[PDB]
Design a binder for this molecule. Sequence first.
Ligand SMILES: [Cu+2]
Length: 220
Amino acid sequence: HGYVSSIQANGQTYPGADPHNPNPESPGWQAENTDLGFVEPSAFSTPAIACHKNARAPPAHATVQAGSTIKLTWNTWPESHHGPVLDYIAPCNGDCSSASAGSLNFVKIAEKGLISGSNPGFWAADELIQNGNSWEVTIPANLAPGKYVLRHEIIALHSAGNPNGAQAYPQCINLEVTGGGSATPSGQPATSFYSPNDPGILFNLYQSFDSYPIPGPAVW
Ligand SMILES: [Cu+2]
């Protein structure tokens, strides 16, 4: 349990989207993750998996040049919640202030899963804790200018050995990308990412293994 509480682009720092205090200057999507909780695998076929429960587009955006870095800080992250950290992006039409999360066509732009070991092993989520509860996302240098939605996610696997036990923590952020990129992605809705029986979703931390198959589509 946790949420993205701060968003940095050089510098400019923005507050994250606290579900108990919707804030007009935050570029984080305004969701009903009031427990700072997760979306369960049975909901991976519903719009909740895009930007979290009942998420609504915010009226602010972070501005960032293609090729530069966004640094995201979580308010906290528990050591128990081992799992991958994944980043996706979708173009957004219009000013992105009325966009439906379920209609966004995302591509994956970065991922990290198991780093080393097993039972339970050391994971991207553990690195995120060691970094200071923070993660960096590089916006692809050839991404064309425009309005986009960044979807940053941890999938916690501490109960994922049981059916419906994985816990997905998506957090969406409105971006305006600037610069000299030329390419636009051809993505798919977030309901296409994951299934309850994917090997990286139904995954037992508490045994020996030497790899982890990261779920979702290929990095763009
Ligand atoms: Cu939790």
